[PDB]
Amino acid sequence: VTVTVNKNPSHTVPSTLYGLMFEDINHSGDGGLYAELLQNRAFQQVTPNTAAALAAWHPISNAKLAVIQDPSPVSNALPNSLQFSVPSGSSGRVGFTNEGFWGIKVDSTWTYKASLFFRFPTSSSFSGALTVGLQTNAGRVLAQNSTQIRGTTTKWTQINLELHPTASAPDVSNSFFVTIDGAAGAGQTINFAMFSLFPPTFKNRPNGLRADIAETLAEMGPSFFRFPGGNNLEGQTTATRWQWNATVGSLLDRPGRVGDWGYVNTDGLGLLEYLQFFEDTGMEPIMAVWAGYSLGGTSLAENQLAPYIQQAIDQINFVIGDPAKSAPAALRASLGHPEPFTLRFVEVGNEDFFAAGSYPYRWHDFVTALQAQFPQIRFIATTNAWNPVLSPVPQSYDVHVYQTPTWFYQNAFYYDGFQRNGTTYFEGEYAAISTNANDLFGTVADGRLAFPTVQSATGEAAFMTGLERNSDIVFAASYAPLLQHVNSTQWTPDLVSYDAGSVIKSTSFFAQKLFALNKGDQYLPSTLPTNGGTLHWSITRASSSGKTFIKIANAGSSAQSLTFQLTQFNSVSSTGTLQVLTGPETASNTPEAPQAIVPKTSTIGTGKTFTYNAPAFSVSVITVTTN
Ligand SMILES: *[C@@H]1O[C@H](CO)[C@@H](O[C@@H]2O[C@H](CO)[C@@H](O[C@@H]3O[C@H](CO)[C@@H](O)[C@H](O)[C@@H]3O)[C@H](O)[C@H]2NC(C)=O)[C@H](O)[C@H]1NC(C)=O
Ligand SMILES: *[C@@H]1O[C@H](CO)[C@@H](O[C@@H]2O[C@H](CO)[C@@H](O)[C@H](O)[C@H]2NC(C)=O)[C@H](O)[C@H]1NC(C)=O
Ligand SMILES: *[C@@H]1O[C@H](CO)[C@@H](O[C@@H]2O[C@H](CO)[C@@H](O)[C@H](O)[C@H]2NC(C)=O)[C@H](O)[C@H]1NC(C)=O
Ligand SMILES: *[C@@H]1O[C@H](CO)[C@@H](O[C@@H]2O[C@H](CO)[C@@H](O)[C@H](O)[C@H]2NC(C)=O)[C@H](O)[C@H]1NC(C)=O
Ligand SMILES: OC[C@@H]1O[C@@H](O)[C@H](O)[C@H]1O
Ligand SMILES: [Cl-]
After folding, report:
1. Helices (DSSP H) in 453-586: which residue ranges?
2. Residue 486, ligand 4, Cβ within 6 A
3. N-to-C CA span, the chain
4. Cis peptide before 230, with omega less than 30 degrees from 0?
5. Does the CB atom of residue 243 touch ligand 1 within 6 A?
6. Strand 560-565 to 2-4 pairing
7. Which residues of 434-457 are buried (b: 16+ CB within 10 A; e: fewer)?
8. 339 labelled catalytic
9. What's domain 2-12+523-625's superfamily in CATH?
10. CATH number for the segment(s) 20-33+213-394
11. CB 607 within 8 A of CB 572
């Protein structure tokens, strides 16, 4: 096919076109992006005196463990304590371990920060060292530090100890430990609460993020971060919804919540930590507010909304408000960030098409209130576009689609026929998730993708060329889900996967990265691809530099030739760069082969005419300079 490139741009490409979608799913927050290494660190939202309250915790030697409703808890938010009892007659090493989130990476190049709170409920004569550390799951100690404690300490006391491993572990099958001398401790009980173990964090942020994952997200050049959901915003019930205020301040005062994917969220990754990450990466937020619906099917009545609308206002004021004018903004200032953060986009609920009966009044009441307080924010509706009819008329809709790879290339013209009437569209969740059109949300045996494939990424890339062509009305687009702990998965496929020690960048991740990093501010119209065809392209140009990015998706099984005609330009560089992602149709990056499919960069001859053969199942970016 001959592709003629117009020199005259048709529209400005939004700064926001490519970004990320985040919720805590697949242990993407706790166990993932949030750097805390101990699972069930503070016994949040568990039932005292149950086995499940002890999840991730194990005795050393003859230690007796129970999670109790402490008569004197460390805080109101953390009513549960670990009761650690040493039997009479004990000796040697007695204590307990935490297995982490399916392991803990122990790296001698890292300093770890351990902490805990303790008290003796019964004043005792105990006088001896409390040791914390890291051990292999065979009990081989790799790091340790200690401090003196006294049985007379009957009020909560924090211990803070650094840990320096003597050797890196050969795998992630390691645990955190706490021990005392069994003879010194014989017959005694200690209550513990609010444990933590951190590695070095991204940008050395206090209470920050896991470095390899954070860097991987930054590597993709995202422009926005949609958060905190997604389903995990909604709760199963009003009472279990995400609440911003429960996520800010001291970790002692964060109660955690049962999230929407089968596990407790600590809310250690809370609103301020999200905002700091955006500062650290240059992303801007697309922040959701809870909108009166939860996943059990309950809509709050219209005459019930006011306190929830106020909570949304409070949430936004925490982000952007003048500290002198609201308590949430004063709180932001008091936590060390008096300056407002950026916030241009707020999403009202999540997937309210499932609650489209009540969304008209919820949308109306939330948006009229929020727009009145925040006249510069653009509010995004979550129902299906234009059905039901909302008031006020939405400026934006969030469109989600989970489909087959084929659907994505067949639907690259999704936005071409939309009216240009002042509405913008956020493709806030999309992914090619299955090869089985008859059972998209099924099992792997029934065609569900365990990991993105070259087929899925190239189908998505074809669709993305349509997002970029239609970026006069498409302002933002994010794959979902973003992150997956391979040891605790509720949804596949996911953009980036990991275990306790390493990261897997998917085929889809590379398609995302190639689109986001090679994106000009000008859209250059070109010969249209065949609507329904497997071969797609989109061309943009950087106004300041003339860097011109030709993005090509071949989502099909046939190689396809493209001849590019740039004769309208005064000049075209004599060479360009080629970045190509390709491989067998069903190839994936997996924990066992994490670099099976990676992009390749080379230099090609260019000018006013050049020919490229786009391989079967490929994403290609050709970069030339044009003036
Ligand atoms: C985060 O902020 C919200 C908003 O203040 C807090 O939620 C509020 O919590 C109070 C205390 O639970 C709720 O009050 C109770 O209301 C019911 C029935 O209307 C009544 O039976 C009780 O005696 C009591 O008055 C209040 O309704 C609730 N508001 C909302 C919007 O949920 C929340 O507790 C804060 N979270 C943290 C961790 O600080
Ligand atoms: C045990 O932990 C303590 C407390 O973290 C470590 O002492 C700290 O060391 C850092 C680095 O020198 C200092 O910045 C802090 O001021 C120290 N605090 C205290 C209270 O001493 C100590 O180095 C650790 N020891 C081992 C063997 O890991
Ligand atoms: C932008 O264009 C779309 C497409 O015509 C409009 O969508 C229609 O909206 C009405 C209600 O307002 C519905 O009854 C139609 O089904 C919608 N059409 C389609 C194809 O979805 C939308 O109203 C326009 N918006 C503005 C702001 O002018
Ligand atoms: C976490 O997941 C990883 C990856 O799936 C598991 O490691 C794999 O385990 C299977 C079955 O034992 C092996 O055949 C693979 O060779 C392993 N892959 C790699 C890359 O090591 C790991 O065992 C899981 N961890 C836990 C605690 O369940
Ligand atoms: O990305 C996974 C889920 O898909 C959509 O149903 C939900 O918003 C999201 O939580
Ligand atoms: Cl398919």
Report:
1. 454-469, 507-517
2. yes
3. 24
4. yes
5. yes
6. parallel
7. bbbeeebeeeeeebbbbbbbbbbb
8. no
9. Golgi alpha-mannosidase II (2.60.40.1180)
10. 3.20.20.80
11. yes
Q: What experimental approach yielded this model?
A: X-ray
Place of tokens 């009513």: 79
Residues with CB under 5 A from ligand 6 (ion): 404-406, 435
CA 381, 385, 391, 393 torsion-angle sign = positive
3-class DSSP assignment, residue 605? strand
Q: What angle do CA 486, 491, 494 make, to 5 degrees?
A: 65
Among all ligands shown, which has an atom nearest to the Cα of 434? 6
| Residue 468 three-state SS | helix
Choosing from 241, 351, 384 the residue with most ligand 5 atoms within 8 A of its CB, the one to mutate for a pocket test is 351
Rounded-to-integer distance, Cα 245 and Cα 379, Å: 21
Distance CA 244, CA 345 (A): 17
**For residue 288, which of 377, 355, 364, 348 has the smallest C-alpha distance?**
348
Ligand 3 binding residues, C-beta < 6 A: 385-386, 389, 393, 419, 421-423
The segment(s) of the chain belonging to CATH 2.60.120.260 are 52-198
Q: At what angle do helices 271-281 and 306-320 cross, to 10 degrees?
A: 40
The segment(s) of the chain belonging to CATH 3.20.20.80 are 20-33+213-394
Resolution (A): 1.3
CA of 316: how far to CAs of 287, 288, 346, 425, in Å?
Answer: 9, 10, 9, 22
**Looking at the chain, which residues constitute the CATH 2.60.40.1180 domain(s)?**
2-12+523-625
> What values do phi and psi take at 595, rounded to 5?
-125, 35
Superfamily of domain 52-198: Galactose-binding domain-like (2.60.120.260)
3-state helix, strand, coil in the chain (%, to 5): 20, 35, 50
Q: CB count, 10 Å around CB of 194?
A: 26
Find the radius of gyration of the CA atoms of the chain. Answer: 27
Q: Which ligand is nearest to the CA of 411?
A: 6
